[PDB]
Design a protein around this nucleic acid. Structure first.
Lengths: 152, 170, 100, 146, 91
RNA sequence: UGAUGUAUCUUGGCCGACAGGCCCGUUCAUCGUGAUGGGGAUAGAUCAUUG
């Protein structure tokens, strides 16, 4: 065939891992990105040197590569734990950003956490009750099962 | 029986028997075997269908049916794979994944490698890249007629394995 | 005309999910297939002789093309002078080929 | 040529006014941001990548129509006007404005230029110069409307 | 280890009570030992009393409340004097 | 009959992302009718302020 200015294409990412998004503008698509708000998304594109209206899926290779690196790690931003290395387990490490599978994975480390530590938070997970406070008065069907016939 | 103490090498030194890149997931959960596409790209030749034999208790009654896919590579094609594959898991890291038998294996998404995501219609997270290392003489346990077991004398060691691979680009 | 089932201790019934969903567009707007001629001539150009003027949305619906997708097509034609749009706030407006 | 102009600095539907004005504002020497913007300045969407036509100008322009009629007007008078900051339903917000940082930055650059002065309590008042660009532009616009 | 003045948290530190304060150094110098029967909950953790036997009364029995190898940049009453309140509607 | 963005006891103003702490005193870019740019539930990290 004749080489026309973008192939035909379409695209499949894994990006983080396993994940394949498309149809959307890059700015808006990125919001998906197991790493972004509407607030974040615009920043990463311009820094990366990517327009708003360019869909993420239509882009050439190197533009996408720059995305994959910039999100997890980039120029006038960073993030590093620090303090004196003292503290064992858990900390914060400096707002993991990051985001996404590392955050879901650490969110387990964090569940697991409280529980051995024996704090009131962990103690709640073992029990299965919702930890940051609801009305309770009703609503919480999810929190530990379906409506369970009468009672006793 | 390790006989090293002589006057050594070129038959002794390790070589690559094979690199098998194998997927295990199943049909229906991602698809037909569509991460064949992803294998196809990363390795450079087409993967071949995996059927199963024996037990499951969990869905998986059909028996004869597509469930998995693999690429057994070797020559330059295996090495070329190693170079890309070798650099992605980080290094260095670690004695435990090596068996004593002198083979080592790792996981990660096919999407790791240079490669387009755009071409792979699916990515799929993990499944063994396996590297089979052996000495020249293997051909005796492999070949049909005059099969002989490989002796303790011949068989690669993790130490030997770590060394030859640690010799190259990690 | 009816709704669906009814809830379960949980719970809710629903029943309904849709047609689908293709004309994803903007991806097919870049690559040649819908962009080069066909979408403009067939959808846009073929429709016009039957009715000289049509609203963009109506065109949207019959043609089964995305509002954004033939906004772009319309704009190209407009430059050609094949079509002339008018205006309106809701991005709605009217689409005409030629006056005559 | 004057007649449409003059008035129109005042009476014209902003939207062509703000648009019309922002291009004239571009020419100026100034626009130092000293990287303050980047941290997360506005509503949601709204970090300042878009801003080179869309925030900065239209914001600079923004004050400027307001100040003529409204004056005297101060930093709180600015912060508010776009904003929400609604008592929530508690399922929403809404967005969040700032906007002490925002207001401040637009007012400084204008002062260096000679456009705005500050009264010791009534806030800052239009100079001869500030009327002079705003109104000589409100001039192009009334023509494009009619 | 290594350690020196100043430590993080979120809007807590200043003046605080004196009766549990005066008590706590005492097992340092005369060694690790018996639990300390303290209801007082407003005493922010500080790394000096690391790895030591403490109690707190949530209420009618003591619930032994060790400072661990993990337990510090947290708040005192969390540890073992609300899991009794909570535990008994999860049994 | 939507969404969002822009536009249509308090304060001055210098410094800030919310949250503060002071010196004086409907327009239109977008939305493509998409369980999403819907929806904000939930949970974790963490900063200030009332106390």
């Amino acid at each position: 065939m004749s080489l026309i200015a973008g192939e035909e294409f379409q695209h499949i990412l894994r990006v983080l891992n396993t994940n394949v998004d498309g149809k959307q503008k890059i700015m808006f698509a990125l919001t998906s990105i197991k790493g972004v708000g509407r607030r974040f998304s615009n920043i990463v594109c311009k820094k990366a040197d990517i327009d708003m209206n360019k869909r993420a899926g239509e882009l050439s290779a190197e533009e996408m590569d720059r995305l994959m690196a910039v999100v997890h790690n980039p120029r006038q931003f960073k993030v590093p734990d620090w303090f004196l290395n003292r503290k064992k387990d858990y900390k914060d490490g400096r707002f993991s950003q990051v985001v996404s599978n590392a955050v879901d994975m650490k969110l387990r480390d964090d569940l697991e956490r409280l529980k051995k530590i024996r704090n009131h938070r962990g103690l709640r997970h073992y029990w299965g009750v919702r930890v940051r406070g609801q009305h309770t008065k009703t609503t919480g069907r999810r929190g530990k099962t379906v409506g369970v016939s009468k009672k006793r | 029986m390790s006989t090293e103490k002589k006057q050594l090498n070129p038959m002794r030194d390790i070589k690559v028997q094979k690199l098998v890149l194998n997927i295990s997931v199943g049909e229906s959960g991602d698809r037909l075997t569509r991460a064949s596409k992803v294998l196809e790209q990363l390795s450079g030749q087409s993967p071949v269908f995996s059927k199963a034999r024996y037990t499951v208790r969990s869905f998986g009654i059909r028996r004869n049916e597509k469930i998995a896919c693999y690429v057994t590579i070797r020559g330059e094609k295996a090495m070329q794979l190693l170079e890309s594959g070798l650099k992605v898991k980080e290094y260095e890291l670690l004695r435990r994944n090596f068996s004593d038998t002198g083979c080592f294996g790792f996981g990660i998404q096919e999407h790791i490698d240079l490669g387009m995501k755009y071409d792979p219609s699916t990515g799929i997270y993990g499944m063994d890249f396996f590297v089979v290392l052996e000495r020249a003489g293997y051909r005796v346990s492999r070949r049909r007629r005059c099969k002989a077991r490989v002796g303790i004398h011949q068989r690669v060691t993790k130490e030997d394995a770590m060394k030859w691979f640690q010799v190259k680009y990690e | 005309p009816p709704p669906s089932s009814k809830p379960a201790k949980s719970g809710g019934g629903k029943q309904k999910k849709k047609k689908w969903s293709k004309g994803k567009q903007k991806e097919k707007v870049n690559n040649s297939v819908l962009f080069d001629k066909a979408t403009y001539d067939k959808l846009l150009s073929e429709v016009p002789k039957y009715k000289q003027i049509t609203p963009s949305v109506l065109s949207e619906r019959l043609r089964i093309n995305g509002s954004l997708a033939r906004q772009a097509i319309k704009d190209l034609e407009s430059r050609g002078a094949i079509r002339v749009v008018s205006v309106h706030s809701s991005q709605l407006i009217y689409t005409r080929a030629t006056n005559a | 040529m004057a007649d449409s102009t003059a008035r129109t600095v005042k009476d014209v539907n902003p939207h062509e006014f703000v648009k019309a004005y922002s291009a004239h504002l571009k020419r100026s020497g100034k626009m130092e941001l000293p990287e303050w913007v980047d941290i997360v300045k506005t509503a949601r969407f709204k970090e300042l990548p878009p801003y080179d036509p869309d925030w900065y100008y239209t914001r600079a322009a923004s004050i400027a129509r307001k100040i003529y009629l409204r004056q005297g007007i101060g930093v709180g008078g600015f912060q508010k006007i776009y904003g929400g900051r609604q008592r929530n339903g508690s399922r929403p917000p809404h967005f969040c404005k700032s906007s002490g940082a925002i207001s401040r930055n637009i007012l400084q650059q204008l002062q260096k230029m000679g456009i705005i002065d500050v009264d010791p309590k009534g806030g800052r008042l239009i100079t001869s110069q500030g009327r002079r660009d705003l109104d000589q532009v409100a001039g192009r616009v009334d023509v494009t409307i009619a | 280890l290594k350690r020196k003045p100043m430590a993080l948290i979120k809007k807590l530190r200043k003046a605080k009570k004196d009766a549990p304060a005066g008590e706590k150094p005492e097992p340092v110098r005369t060694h690790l030992r018996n639990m300390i029967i303290v209801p007082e909950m407003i005493g922010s953790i500080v790394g000096v009393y690391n790895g030591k036997t403490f109690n707190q009364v949530e209420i009618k029995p003591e619930m032994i409340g060790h400072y661990l190898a993990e337990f510090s940049i947290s708040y005192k009453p969390v540890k073992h004097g609300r899991p009794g309140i909570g535990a008994t509607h999860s049994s």
